[PDB]
Design an enzyme around this catalytic site. Sequence first.
Site, PDB file in Angstrom:
ATOM      1  CG  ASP A   8      14.935  26.523   8.789  1.00 45.17           C
ATOM      2  OD1 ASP A   8      14.581  27.510   8.231  1.00 45.17           O
ATOM      3  OD2 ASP A   8      15.562  25.594   8.161  1.00 45.17           O
ATOM      4  CD  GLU A  48       8.046  30.240  12.011  1.00 48.02           C
ATOM      5  OE1 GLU A  48       7.760  30.519  10.869  1.00 48.02           O
ATOM      6  OE2 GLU A  48       9.070  29.466  12.315  1.00 48.02           O
TER       7      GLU A  48
END
Length: 164
Positions: A20, A11
């Site tokens: 994202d 991440e």
Amino acid sequence: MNYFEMLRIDEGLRLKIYKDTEGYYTIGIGHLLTKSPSLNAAKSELDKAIGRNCNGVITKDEAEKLFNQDVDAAVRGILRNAKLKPVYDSLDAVRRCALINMVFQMGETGVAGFTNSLRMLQQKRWDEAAVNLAKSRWYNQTPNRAKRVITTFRTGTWDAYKNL
């Protein structure tokens, strides 16, 4: 290596709101804020999440706190889910991390639908499972991360992350 470090690798760490891979507003270590297009809605969610006026920016510590909460939630989500729990209970400690990774990424709900793969995993047919997992939007969209998780399920080792 544990599921926290594994997710920290997959991440990243970002101290300012960002979008994202799906274009959603996120902050920290994969902390989804809102699927809404408003930067305003995001900052609002952000502030409610942290308990201060952040103006779209958080510290390392704040990110780590959010992260621990999200990890805990993924774990508690697996254990509370009737489809996921038995798989998780059947796995060794390394593969357990891989399932946790999927759940953090795509939610309980999303993982619970990979019915076929879940069944292979429970039966310990690793190769077959790795093959079924790869036939998904998940793999096509985030192929490098998906390969890493898939290899972890396939071999039961941390090899895919030892590179990184």
